[PDB]
Design a protein around this ligand. Structure first.
Ligand SMILES: Nc1ncnc2c1ncn2[C@@H]1O[C@H](COP(=O)(O)O)[C@@H](O)[C@H]1O
Ligand SMILES: N#Cc1c(O)c2c(-c3ccc(Br)cc3)c(Br)sc2[nH]c1=O
Ligand SMILES: [Cl-]
Ligand SMILES: [Cl-]
Ligand SMILES: [Cl-]
Ligand SMILES: [Cl-]
Ligand SMILES: [Cl-]
Lengths: 158, 267, 362
């Protein structure tokens, strides 16, 4: 379906288009918005507005000047426009922060020694390390595989 | 029973949140075993920084192999252990005869996990995700026969390496090496079994830092801290094993039935 | 003839919501009533919120909880997008509490349970509806809560905190009014806490016309407990309205709490983070680059304290990425944080980090 919206005031506002044999269909008023919703076959369609005695196009919307000086609006209705996620897709075309306390909370320090508490999603993939206690560096991080977690401890010399 | 393992993925046995220790092959082999102890872990994958891949698994067996290969006396330090790297020793251990990294995937079935432990003569298997390369968790016999017991809703009918009380550690370590056995039952004055010295007991040397004296008796070693009969049912043998969380059960020794053996029958 | 969408004739504007107008929809033949969010494609790109709506729809389109407003269908047109959603006759909880007084302990609890079930459902789906207030809590004919304005909501990604200081300042958490970083669920708990107070008192715990003294009182966590209030609910409010997010009640702590547990229906439910330095924060950022380039690793400077760096692997021949953030800890200290980026990955991440650390300050 297509949305034909006239913006601005008017006692009576009508949409005349190619799609309706240039008949005068009336638009429903909100405040300063006059709308008619109607589905029309994807392709080319010309329209115009009969707003209180005067025939105008929508200046903001695409026009088409005819061989006879006729200026009507135009609408190229796409397949892209009808499918939501394809439409949103085509539509899309200091000082340091303070360290959140959530990051200072470790699952290692806080049964089985190879079993740890489930972690806060927020402190996943962050690097944690132990002080270099003579030439050996200890690095650690918690990550998630499927619905399970693994805290990898690397013992690497320097 | 056999079909059960052919279905469920390795991942199902992976714990909710677990720990995993990985040592770079370039780490000093003493610090390596010492770290296992401190991290409460019996085995650790080995990453080769140059090769950019997991090349192996450091285990307690590696400690037993180093100790026995280079124990001079209680008088002189095991210079070798005190200053070899993991890479230097894995070179020595596997000279012309080399063993690659054996592992399983999370997606792969539990049958592919039990058969690999047997087919490769190993007790610990690392579950590795191929989409990542990341080692996730080291799956074990005890872990598999735990879940195989959380689902179940004669011994002689179904169907040896020993050490004395006096026997020193060195000698026992030697037996573990030339036999390829996990635990060693202890015999007293007569053929009556009083205790059992396992590969696990060997890490208490690393823990207490007492490895530079293997001249001490197996009993003296065991001072820092279970059996079955043949007329008992195989299911009762399974029930008793896990209820005590052990690896094998043997008043005189006749045979020892292990977790790796029950898994060979149920496959 | 009246304006239709679906076969719903568009009626009166229910409200003006987050991004667009919400109007009634009465079905042509059945009489069924829906609420319709009208989003102008051109307005939603003027505010660069297109991404936000793409996601909002994505989440809302699958959620099916009884105390959250259902997103029946999204009708796209060349000019505008229509969000057809369930309509509730009772309207704002705000106006309910306005017209009627405060709710009795029994009734208050019923609704707080329903509201929290919903808040809980969101968080369980990685969605944190910032903007939780009796103005966004709607009522149906049978007096059920219905969480309604997800325009301000956001996703919860592994490893990240949110920043957007969003929602009414009365219901906004201290860390939100302070514009600090947050995990997300804790700002919803603090909002649910003020909702609970409103249900039980008919007033706001934190409320002042002098904006600066309102903002102080929020960070002072101080609010008044009237004589009628039950000490067991007082304990609960005290736990939810904690200024320390680490000291703040969790959806579990709430579930576990005795006042909550009551009559509740069934259907409802030493390590160091990175390397810390003391130089001027711009010297530290200079220090990082005269170390990253020194390692020949491609990057992209996002913020003046955020960098998205990649390393070229010589062996596996596969690029590995990590992001670096610099925070502040003391009045006198700063801290460089290393976060892994998803495409062995993990080991290569530690390696990527370590090299950088040996040539860097504490
Ligand atoms: N002390 C032992 N003496 C002889 N064989 C053993 C001993 N311990 C284990 N085995 C055998 O070694 C294999 C693997 O068992 P295990 O190393 O105990 O998990 C099985 O074939 C066992 O029967
Ligand atoms: N502000 C505003 C605003 C709108 O009122 C609309 C409308 C609309 C107008 C009147 C009636 Br009656 C029903 C719907 C459509 Br259809 S698209 C649209 N876009 C906007 O931004
Ligand atoms: Cl206009
Ligand atoms: Cl409004
Ligand atoms: Cl009506
Ligand atoms: Cl209703
Ligand atoms: Cl109120």
């Amino acid at each position: 379906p297509t949305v034909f919206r006239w913006t601005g005031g008017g006692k009576e506002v009508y949409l005349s288009g190619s799609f309706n044999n240039w008949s005068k269909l009336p638009l429903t008023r909100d405040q300063n918005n006059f709308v008619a919703i109607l589905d029309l076959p994807e392709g080319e369609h010309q329209y115009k507005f009969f707003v209180d005695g005067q025939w105008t196009h929508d200046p903001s919307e695409p026009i088409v000047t005819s061989q006879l000086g006729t200026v009507n609006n135009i609408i190229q209705v796409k397949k892209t426009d009808f499918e939501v996620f394809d439409a949103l897709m085509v539509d899309s075309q200091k000082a340091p922060p303070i360290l959140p306390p959530h990051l200072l909370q470790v699952i290692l320090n806080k049964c089985d020694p190879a079993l740890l508490p489930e972690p806060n999603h927020v402190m996943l993939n962050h690097l944690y390390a132990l002080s270099i206690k003579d030439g050996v560096m200890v690095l650690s991080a918690t990550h998630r595989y499927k619905k399970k977690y693994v805290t990898t401890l690397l013992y690497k010399p320097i | 029973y056999t079909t059960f393992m052919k279905s469920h993925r390795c991942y199902d046995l992976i714990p909710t949140s677990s720990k995993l220790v990985v040592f770079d092959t370039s780490l000093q082999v003493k610090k390596a075993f010492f770290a296992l102890v401190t991290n409460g872990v019996r085995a650790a994958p080995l990453w080769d920084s140059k090769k950019q891949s997991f090349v192996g698994m450091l285990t307690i067996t590696d400690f037993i192999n180093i100790l026995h290969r280079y124990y001079k006396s209680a008088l002189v330090q095991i210079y070798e252990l005190e200053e070899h790297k993991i890479e230097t020793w894995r070179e020595v251990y596997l000279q012309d005869s080399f063993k690659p990294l054996v592992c399983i995937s999370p997606n792969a079935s539990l049958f592919d996990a039990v058969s690999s432990l047997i087919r490769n003569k190993i007790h610990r298997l690392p579950v590795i995700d191929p989409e990542s390369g990341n080692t996730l968790y080291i799956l074990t016999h005890k872990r598999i026969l735990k879940f195989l017991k959380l689902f179940i809703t004669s011994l002689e009918e179904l169907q040896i390496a020993m050490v004395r009380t006096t026997t020193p550690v060195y000698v026992a370590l030697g037996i573990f090496v030339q036999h390829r056995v996990s635990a060693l039952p202890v015999v007293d004055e007569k053929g009556r079994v009083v205790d059992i010295y396992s590969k696990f007991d060997v890490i208490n040397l690393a823990a207490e830092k007492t490895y530079n004296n293997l001249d001490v008796s197996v009993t003296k070693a065991l001072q820092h801290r279970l059996k079955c009969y043949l007329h008992e049912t195989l299911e009762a043998i399974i029930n008793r094993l896990v209820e005590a969380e052990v690896h094998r059960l043997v008043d005189v020794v006749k045979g020892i039935v292990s977790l790796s053996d029950i898994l060979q029958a149920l496959v | 003839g009246r304006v239709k969408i679906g076969h719903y004739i568009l009626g009166d504007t229910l409200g003006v919501g987050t991004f667009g107008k919400v109007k009634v929809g009465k079905h042509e033949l059945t009489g069924h009533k829906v609420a319709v969010k009208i989003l102008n494609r051109q307005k939603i790109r003027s505010l660069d919120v297109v991404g936000k709506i793409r996601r909002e729809i994505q989440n809302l389109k699958l959620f099916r909880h009884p105390h959250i407003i259902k997103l029946y269908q999204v009708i796209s047109t060349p000019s505008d997008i229509f969000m057809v959603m369930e309509y509730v006759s009772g309207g704002e909880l705000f106006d309910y509490i306005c017209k009627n007084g405060r709710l009795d302990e029994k009734e208050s609890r019923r609704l707080f349970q329903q509201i929290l079930s919903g808040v809980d459902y969101c968080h369980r789906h990685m969605v944190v509806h910032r903007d939780l207030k009796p103005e966004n809590v709607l009522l149906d004919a049978h007096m059920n809560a219905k969480i309604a304005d997800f325009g301000l909501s956001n996703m919860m990604s592994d490893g990240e905190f949110l920043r957007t200081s969003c929602g009414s300042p009365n219901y906004a958490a201290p860390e939100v009014i302070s514009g600090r970083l947050y995990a997300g669920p804790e700002v919803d708990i603090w909002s649910s806490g003020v909702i609970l107070y409103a249900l039980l008192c008919g007033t706001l715990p934190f409320d002042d016309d002098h904006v600066p003294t309102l903002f102080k009182k929020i960070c002072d966590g101080i609010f008044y407990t009237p004589q009628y209030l039950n000490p067991s609910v007082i304990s609960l409010l005290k736990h939810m309205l904690q200024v320390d997010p680490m000291k703040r009640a969790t959806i579990k702590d709430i579930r576990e709490h005795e006042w909550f547990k009551q009559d509740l229906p069934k259907y409802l439910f030493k390590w160091h983070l990175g390397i810390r330095s003391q130089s001027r924060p711009n010297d530290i950022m200079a220090e990082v680059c005269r170390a990253i380039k020194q390692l020949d690793y491609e990057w992209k400077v996002v913020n003046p304290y955020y960098l998205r760096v990649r390393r070229k692997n010589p062996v596996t021949s596969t690029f590995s990425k990590m992001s670096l953030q610099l925070y502040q800890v003391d009045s006198r200290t700063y801290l460089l944080d290393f976060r892994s980026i998803d495409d062995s990955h993990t080991i290569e991440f530690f390696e990527m980090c370590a090299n950088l650390i040996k040539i860097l300050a504490q």
